[PDB]
């Protein structure tokens, strides 16, 4: 497929970088990030969806608020739940709370969820190139916690489904002097990494990034 892609360049399709605070809710920022882009790509509307709703309400889908979750599961939740409210009506508190979802306030909806075949990074490249930014999970080690900039490459991480522990959003890809990489949006604030983003080597299922990826197909 194309040599490089970047949804931020194509238009106003990628929302600003957010911060999960001290709650392990990255899976929710990866979910909203994917859905915000999908809705903007399909309708041109740029919304900011409530991650707190997922933290307080998605337990029926094997999610655990500040203790973890998976984007595919959160996409299914939004789907059956019939909607997710905006950030302005269900504010991010950053802590496990009681669900306050109001059906009349839902602004974004999911029709279906596409789950990338386990470990199929090429398929992930196609999804990013052709359809939407992709949510994925990978194993973060101490090596990565020292990251400042550049193409992250490591020998310490594993590529197995039971090792992935952080959820992020692939917004594009490219290569530099033969080294292919992914442009990834994080939710640790804009002061982390490269203005809130990071590059990671592509083509090696680096840290298991292709083990559990998914993207939503919105109901618009």
């Amino acid at each position: 497929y194309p040599p490089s892609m970047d949804w931020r360049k194509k238009g106003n399709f990628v929302s600003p970088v957010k911060n999960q605070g001290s709650c392990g809710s990255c899976w929710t920022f990866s979910t909203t990030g994917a859905l915000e882009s999908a809705v903007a790509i399909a309708t041109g509307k740029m919304l900011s969806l409530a991650e707190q709703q997922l933290v307080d309400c998605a337990q029926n889908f094997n999610n655990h608020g500040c203790q973890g979750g998976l984007p595919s599961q959160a996409f299914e939740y939004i789907r059956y739940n019939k909607g997710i409210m905006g950030e302005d009506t269900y504010p991010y508190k950053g802590q496990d709370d009681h669900c306050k979802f109001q059906p009349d306030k839902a602004i974004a909806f999911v029709k279906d969820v596409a789950n990338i075949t386990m470990n199929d990074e090429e398929a992930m490249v196609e999804a990013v190139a052709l359809y939407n930014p992709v949510s994925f999970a990978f194993e973060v080690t101490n090596d990565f916690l020292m990251y400042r900039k550049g193409i992250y490459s490591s020998t310490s991480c594993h590529k197995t489904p039971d090792k992935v522990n952080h959820a992020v959003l692939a917004v594009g890809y490219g290569e530099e002097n033969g080294i292919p990489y992914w442009i990834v949006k994080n939710s640790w604030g804009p002061q982390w990494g490269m203005n809130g983003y990071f590059l990671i080597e592509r083509g090696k299922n680096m840290c298991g990034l292709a083990a559990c990826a998914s993207y939503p197909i919105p109901l618009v």
Partner: peptide, 8 residues
């Protein structure tokens, strides 16, 4: 088949 992933 769904994603049986560790909680990320």
């Amino acid at each position: 088949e769904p994603q049986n992933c560790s909680a990320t």
